[model samples]
Target chain A: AAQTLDGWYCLHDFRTIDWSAWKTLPNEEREAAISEFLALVDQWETTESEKQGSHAVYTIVGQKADILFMILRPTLDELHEIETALNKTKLADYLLPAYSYVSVVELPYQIPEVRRRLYPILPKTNYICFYPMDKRRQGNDNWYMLSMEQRRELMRAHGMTGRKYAGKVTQIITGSVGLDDFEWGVTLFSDDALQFKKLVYEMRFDEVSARFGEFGSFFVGTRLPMENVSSFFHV
Target chain B: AAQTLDGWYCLHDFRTIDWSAWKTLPNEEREAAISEFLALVDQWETTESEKQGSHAVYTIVGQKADILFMILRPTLDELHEIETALNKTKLADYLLPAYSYVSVVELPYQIPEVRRRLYPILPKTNYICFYPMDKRRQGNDNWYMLSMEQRRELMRAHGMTGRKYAGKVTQIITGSVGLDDFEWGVTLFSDDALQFKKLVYEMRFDEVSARFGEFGSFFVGTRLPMENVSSFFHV
Candidate 1:
């Protein structure tokens, strides 16, 4: 059986604003909600500084979700607290919960590198793309049934394909076997949005992916810094 | 070529109620929204009676979604109208769009009243289970790579397993290859909730499902008849 070496737990929360109702709110209340939300962002920054946790915010590019918040924490309790904390905020009243994925960071052989990667600080990339996926378990292509050597060889090749985008993209894989529907959650941080499509399209031909990969909905979004939260909410 | 013959278009919209905002509404307005929603349900009933379209409402069992509306329409235009009509309702203001699946009922070269297969009247059962799935597309298990006769034989056995539960469960299979993330949407209606688990569990052992089935989230819910709208939402 395949085992995992897990680290920080991750939560990808997607929310949609009820624009019709939001726009109807008076100027004073709207401004109040924005201020409250910004304060939470400040708290998250403090946590990141302390190495206790980290979070990133982005504005989605489609109807799937208006905003996306990806948070990493040391424990499920802290994650649950953070979720409740947001719901308690004034701004949450005007937003709707769209979707969420729960998983944990996976892997490293170099102890130092492993620790750093497992507890990575949020990257301030211009764009973020996230999706959940699973390795195939079908008759001939079953990843779990393959000999360890065979599996390692396939993954070695897969990593080579990903390495070609070193500077153009940063990728993280989160394990979610029992936590969510998919086996893993993948998030890519990139400066150019188009690269997200290029890399994914190119990887589709890789044997590990072409034959064994099973994927989910792909969500792409642009970074939404706290400084712009007010302007973004302005009708 | 794997060509399909499609019938009625189906939309499964899942929504989470904004309890905080909903409870804040004045009693008069809350009652108004309830009345407006009830009226829409009445219209849906009329459509069902006229054999033009059909719909069902359910209260999901977990956090996935608080409510679900599975609707079928003869044309995309009519389906759009139905969705637009619901959003225009006052009740929609308190509900958050959680998830949605779009697909068309699929069948083969069949009968005249084969029309019934396309425009089906939904069964009003005590429980409902819905999930999207795909056939395995891995190296050896690649479903598309199989010969016509091989595919036919495999599916024949799969159907036999399903037939054993004929009366205990009623299933609707919709094709969503190009319309949504998954290739197919499977919905089940039954008076006994355990049968959903029982039937699905048994099918998992079948060669078809065991070797080729790739599944999605399993959402289970209880029926929410129109008359209970106000009761279901009462604070």
Candidate 2:
């Protein structure tokens, strides 16, 4: 079996602001909370700038969640510390977590080109879609039981489908084998959300996805840019 | 293709308190938040007492989440309302969501005895494990493609495995087909946490799970009784 090349540990933290309670807070407190949060964002940016890690913040759509933050670090401990730190922030008092996913950056059966993309700065797209997944292990459909060459062939066909949407969608895959609930987490970024539906739906019919795939809940959201952070939280 | 008997809609809302930020709040504020939250819990209990619905509160273990509230209602709208109402509470400000699952209580194949257990008052166990899953639909392993007789036979075997742990573990199966991310959500309650591992591991080898079963993230936590609600947030 070909070994996966691992990179940073990843965490996807989703939060839904308690808008009713947030509205009760005085304007000054609200502003202070926003500023405190921005400070945390600044710190994360600095880390990314130094190539130590990367992060992304998005305003999710629907009742599922409000905010989604994707963070990457060299260690799982850092992810935990970061989560704890965020929880302690003034703004966090107004933000209730909606969901969180943990995994590590991985390039399975790695090619050098793909390896370089493992610890990437998330794309600043208008929309993002995230979900966890697994390859089937049922009798003859078992992915792990397949020969390296057989598995590689299937992935090649899968990669070809992904290539068709190259610029339309930027897919970031992270392995979670023993770190989280699912085997892998897939994060997709795109200016047009429809591309996510198209790409995913088309892949579902492909042998790799149709025969071996098992998926989790899907979360889609819009970008919550740093400069617009305050307004996004403004009641 | 036996029809599933549906009962009350269910929501498993998980939250982690920001202890440090919680500590920063004045004692009076903490008291107020606690009182407001208990009042809400009282309402849920009243609903349960009247047999309109059922709910359970638990203190989850590990860093995944701190508090887990599993609520059941006759309608999805009621579940949505309950979630919104909880978000409006003062205590919710300090409770960051770790994860939330949505589903409806279901008993597949119309097993009469099993149907009787659908809308149960959750057991007050020391530990709980929750995860979402799907039946495989891949090539020869497709669950939906199986004849009813074949499906029933396989499920019979699966049921036998579960029966072995009958008294030791209380299993609640919820359907999420069109409600949430997963096709089903499995919640297990037990005094001995290890029993969860044992039961799940043993079932993994069964033809049903070994082949057709596809699972999501697994969350295991301890029960947080209502009486200890105050102490849970004492920090």
Candidate 3:
């Protein structure tokens, strides 16, 4: 039987900006937006200093989103607290909500019963590709109907496929069955994102991923170096 | 020959949360925010059902945003209705707009005069990787100066690369043009998402993608199972 899972809380928040309305604002009004936003950024920086949380901001590529904010915290309450903070800002007034996924760092396969050297910290890969996922439950392809042993067998096989790319790809699978839309979330960190495709492609041939796996949208991003952070946002 | 195009009405709604304000909110105020949000969700559900529209809500990963909501509707008026409704909610007072994109779905390809074996429904590959793209209009390689025939030939080569993956990948090329920040939105579906990387990588070797292609963020997602809809929001 699938059992309770736990780990650090993760929040992926997506947003787009309203250019027309934003541009129409008086210069002073616009300045206020920047000032207020920067103030919040400062607070988040302080939080990071204390090690209570971590946050990264990126300019999301494509029309789907203008900016993305991914935050990780020690508890769900902290995650919610951050969510509430951003919504209260003046800058939030001009931005629009695009998409959001609530999940935690899940490592179901790395449980005590399993034997694997789980990395104590996140891998230092150049790229991070994160997406939420769910299993099919309709018709004959119901994932919930499978016995634990059957699921285990398929998962073991799936794990083997991941092992093939052992050094090239490091995957952290988090189960968010109750917390998010997807049954689980997969976050893959790799030096070369092509390996993300290679590893995931190999897994698709296995029964667990091919037939039963349903996935949510994916966001693939290059990590922002601390030095270039301000340069990325300069108008 | 390529022809001029017109855009249908589109909307991008973005939002960020206010954690500090939310944390300080009295229990009653917090309850009101939740109540207002629930009502809005209910209203959107009814509107979606009536309009045969589609929508997606995701927590974007990264610090770009706190939350995102993507909605596709048949008419621009409905989009406005959603915006008006959101603005009226008490949660709206705290939830800030982060960013937004406005674009219509588009497909521009060389359709054979004779019917092909495949019909026009969306390609049924299991995975989709979508992102917006822009053509370089810098000092040297401006896409606007190209003759229609030249543009077509360039796109032809691009299309050919995708054709090679006919069985492996199904692509939907949507043009956002003037409506969104990026000029085009590319949505690619394939049984193996690796094909997305392969197809894109191969296209990169082609002139169109090699020189003219300036890409926005890339979003790759698996199809969400309808059966898990309720469970996804259990929290």
Reference-based lDDT, residue B4, model 3: 33
Highest DockQ model number? 2
List residue ranges in candidate 1 displaced over 4 A.
Answer: A1-3, A108-110, B1-17, B22-235
lDDT of 2 by residue, B40-73 (tens): 9999999999888988887653347867889999
Compose the digit string of candidate 2's lDDT tens values, residues A107-225.
65365576558778889999999999988786777775566688789998899899999989999898765345777899999999999999999899888999889898899999999
Q: Compare candidates 2 and 3 on lDDT and give the better one.
A: 2
Per-residue C-alpha lDDT of model 3 across residues B108-171, encoded as one tens digit per residue: 2335321111112334344455566788775455677777787889889888887897878765
lDDT score, residue A57, model 1? 97
**In model 2, which regions exceed 4 Å deviation?**
A108-115, B1-15, B18-21, B24-63, B66-235
| Candidate 2 vs. true structure, TM-score | 0.57
lDDT per model vs. reference: 0.81, 0.81, 0.61
What is candidate 1's lDDT per residue for A151-177, written digit by digit as tens? Answer: 788888889888987689889898764
Query: How would you class the docking of model 3?
Result: incorrect
lDDT of 2 at B87: 93
Candidate 3 stretches with Cα past 4 Å from truth are: A1-4, A19-51, A108-124, A226-229, B1-235
